[PDB]
Amino acid sequence: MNAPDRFELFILPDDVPKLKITPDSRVPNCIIIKFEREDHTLANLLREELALYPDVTFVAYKVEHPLFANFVMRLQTEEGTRPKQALERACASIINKLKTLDHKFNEEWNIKN
Amino acid sequence: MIIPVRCFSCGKVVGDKWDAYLRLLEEGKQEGDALDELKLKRYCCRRMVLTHVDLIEKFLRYNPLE
């Protein structure tokens, strides 16, 4: 009866940004990013994809409570890399792989019919 | 009561397969084999039809309310 909305899982509020960055000044070259309105489905995909790269050193996320559709992530790469750039390249590579995936799947369903 | 639509666990729509299930039962089938023919292979869509017990016949036993 205090039951909230279940479009709190994907729709952002008005003056809240979708992507809220705060750089963590404990160690150099690390950042904390307050993602709005998601779950694991973004996060794990970003985790393992940020994992295998060389220049990335530390990357870790947590979902503070699963009855709230938010999560927060930590991102420290090496010295040289602005890590935001690395994550943008990470998105580029993921969409590259998946668009290749859709492409060959279309071809394979064309053959299998 | 009356058959639900999906499964409770998975979500394969099953509600159509009630009348066919009774008609397969009429010939003397066995209930597992009847579910076998309907293509129900996870047990989720096997408990969503196997357990189910029927009351809405009893509600239509009330000779007219109006």
């Binding site: 039951a3 404990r26 985790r47 009855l67 | -």
Partner: protein, 394 residues
């Protein structure tokens, strides 16, 4: 019921209308989650706010002068999980370790050195448990006369707050005084002892997620050979009680101090079937593996004990009323399925079976009388306890 049973807290606002707790505070209030009610009084002034915030707050009531020990410890899952985590042969890849050390609110930002460098970096979980516990601790314990060489890997020595060896279990981090929590309290004040429970529970829940842990019907089963050994032993015990019957009903039995003939007879019976139960449960404990789940839980002590596994798998033992064996409810027998004056264990309520095999109906009913004792106790003597406690208070 004691001076922690009112404790101050802080406010966290959540939807979905129930009260949320930490689960380390489950022990002092004595609350389970089968539907308890807990109240919430509110201050209406500044004065009472500071009164609560400086005295009745949880971090200032950790150590109970009842028994000069901490009474707020670790409960079911965090405990049995951390015991599964810091066994010696548990290794973790670096990637999952990134998250696991992200969960600590007091982690600085420095990973430890992985305890293997090559051929592929791993860890062991004791260093991750060392990430939580702050700098400035010592704890030395000798269990069973261990060495500094540690073959059984029990015991515990901690220097710097980094674990050196040992399986961290209840008898270190439970409610036991002179344990880890008490030591942290004495050496660091309240607040770091507050953050101890946060660090440990969040860590071991994330890891007990990605490991997982379960319990299945096989876990109370031992192989057929150990079942044969338990059956042989308890059969030999029934031979022993037949010897008791033979000598005492052939009047060859010697009488103990202070007890007459039937009292020492029943006392002999009680000792002998308890010996049956103890040796049989011991054999069934000895056979079971260590990847076996139930033995992990009892050897963690988060819930249960030795007699649990003995009763589930090997033997339940004697059904009691008021400490004794069961009265002949009728003349000379304690059901109408028995003969007269048969003091055999299956008459007056010894479950020979496990829980697992099934009970004969009579044995089921005698265990019903056991539950009957427990019910009448827990809803009758609490009268006397309440009245006594009111009178000592006033």
């Amino acid at each position: 019921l004691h001076k922690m049973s009112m404790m101050a807290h802080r406010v966290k606002v959540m939807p979905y209308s129930t009260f949320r707790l930490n689960l380390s505070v489950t022990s002092p209030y004595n609350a389970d989650f089968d539907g308890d009610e807990m109240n919430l009084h509110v201050p209406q002034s500044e004065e009472t706010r500071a009164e609560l915030s400086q005295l009745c707050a949880v971090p200032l009531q950790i150590v109970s002068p009842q028994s000069n020990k901490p009474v707020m410890g670790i409960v079911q899952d965090t405990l049995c999980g951390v015991r599964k985590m810091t066994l010696r042969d548990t290794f973790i890849e670096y990637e999952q370790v990134m998250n696991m050390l992200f969960w600590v609110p007091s982690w600085d930002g420095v990973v430890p050195q992985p305890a293997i460098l090559k051929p592929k970096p791993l860890w062991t979980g004791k260093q991750l448990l060392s990430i939580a516990i702050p700098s400035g601790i010592h704890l030395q314990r000798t269990d069973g006369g261990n060495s500094l060489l540690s073959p059984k890997d029990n015991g515990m020595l901690i220097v710097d707050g980094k674990v050196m060896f040992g399986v961290v279990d209840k008898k270190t981090v439970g409610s036991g005084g002179g344990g880890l929590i008490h030591t942290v309290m004495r050496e660091k004040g309240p607040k770091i002892c507050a953050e101890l429970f946060g660090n440990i529970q969040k860590v071991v829940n994330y890891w007990l997620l990605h490991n997982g842990f379960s319990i299945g019907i096989g876990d109370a089963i031992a192989d057929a050979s150990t079942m044969k050994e338990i059956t042989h032993a308890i059969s030999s015990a029934k031979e022993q009680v037949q010897e008791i019957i033979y000598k005492a009903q052939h009047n060859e039995l010697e009488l103990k101090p202070g007890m007459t003939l039937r009292e020492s007879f029943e006392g002999e019976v009680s000792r002998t079937l308890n010996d049956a139960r103890d040796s049989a449960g011991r054999s069934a404990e000895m056979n079971l593996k260590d990847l076996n789940n139930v033995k992990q839980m009892v050897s963690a002590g988060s819930k249960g004990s030795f007699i649990n596994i003995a009763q589930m798998s090997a033997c339940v033992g004697q059904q009691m009323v008021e400490g004794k064996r069961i009265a002949f409810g009728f003349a000379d027998r304690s059901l109408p399925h028995f003969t007269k004056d048969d003091f055999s264990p299956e008459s007056k309520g010894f479950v020979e079976n496990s829980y697992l095999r099934g009970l004969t109906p009579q044995e089921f009913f005698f265990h019903a009388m056991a539950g009957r004792e427990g019910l009448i106790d827990t809803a009758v003597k609490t009268a006397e306890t309440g009245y006594i406690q009111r009178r000592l208070v006033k």
